[PDB]
Design a protein around this ligand. Structure first.
Ligand SMILES: C[S@@+](CC[C@H](N)C(=O)[O-])C[C@H]1O[C@@H](n2cnc3c(N)ncnc32)[C@H](O)[C@@H]1O
Ligand SMILES: C[S@@+](CC[C@H](N)C(=O)[O-])C[C@H]1O[C@@H](n2cnc3c(N)ncnc32)[C@H](O)[C@@H]1O
Lengths: 168, 172
């Protein structure tokens, strides 16, 4: 099935756990687009509800040159775009470094994947709990050797897309 | 079974394959140190022969902060090797990484098999290592391959993927 990647800037936690909107990091545009294209992701969505942020990201993308990277305002808008491209609603999969008992592995994702997949990646201190609760699935977190697993969102994307590629 | 990572800035290729000395990108410092720490890498070496770069990078590490001995800014691969040899009482296996397939390339699984001592993983900047480093290394890893018409990742993302692959391979 087709795979889409969305980088979301709302609704994130701040250090104090309060809901925030984050600003766009330039390298998240360039780096994740490259990982997306390397592993055959169909489109890369950059989701920010702040018009000023969307205009900053467009300018960066416009000069760095593609219908490939899509700058949009909301997850609802991402879902609508995929339904027009696929004639089917994506499975909504969120990501987190945090433990979730219901979380599935990449292998399990392969077996349960009966339609397009939308992978959600956060910014700042990561998603509020509501995203994790509402998503169709959460992936098991990337862990390494010990307790520390706080990777950049760019590195988390690269790793997950690699694992998805290995598994097929 | 200790793993070390070195980010190198000389000698690198330009777009036309000529030798260049790249400058230290602040995000390579932070982003690769998180990946190394996640996956239990013993030390992260930042290698730049230009004293001005080492100075800038040292300041960035100090401010971004115990674990001040974790990310090591140094001048040459020779210095990296002498440090590991001191820490490990033995010389590491030198493995280079690149997006260009070499006929002699090994897989992670092969790497696991031949790894009887500490491992030093080399990553480049700019447009990658010149052919001399790939010739000089003990081994060169098969590139990360995806869809087939594109594989230009950032070096931060190549480090993440290779460290995950290696971790997983010692769990499977
Ligand atoms: C700077 S991190 C914030 C980390 C936060 N604790 C979280 O929920 O993952 C930004 C994004 O990168 C991804 N990420 C970072 N580390 C991850 C890990 N170890 N496992 C899965 N995703 C990770 C998640 O998508 C996260 O929203
Ligand atoms: C921006 S890349 C330069 C790419 C260059 N064509 C090369 O790989 O030689 C900088 C570093 O990222 C790493 N890298 C990037 N893409 C890679 C890939 N597909 N496979 C392996 N390493 C990669 C290598 O360590 C490379 O030196």
């Amino acid at each position: 099935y087709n795979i889409y990647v969305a980088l979301m800037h709302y609704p994130m936690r701040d250090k104090e756990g309060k809901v925030v909107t984050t600003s766009i990091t330039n390298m998240d545009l360039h780096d994740i687009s490259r990982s997306c294209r390397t592993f055959g992701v169909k489109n890369y969505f950059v989701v920010n509800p702040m018009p000023a942020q969307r205009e900053i990201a467009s300018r960066v993308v416009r000069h760095w040159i593609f219908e490939y990277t899509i700058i949009t305002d909301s997850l609802a808008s991402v879902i609508k775009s995929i339904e027009e491209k696929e004639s089917g609603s994506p499975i909504i999969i969120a990501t987190t470094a945090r433990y979730q008992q219901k979380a599935i592995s990449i292998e399990k994702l392969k077996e349960i994947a009966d339609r397009p997949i939308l992978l959600l990646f956060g910014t700042g201190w990561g998603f509020v709990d509501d995203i994790l609760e509402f998503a169709d699935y959460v992936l098991k977190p990337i862990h390494g050797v010990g307790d520390f697993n706080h990777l950049s969102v760019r590195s988390a994307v690269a790793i997950y897309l690699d694992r998805i590629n290995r598994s097929f």
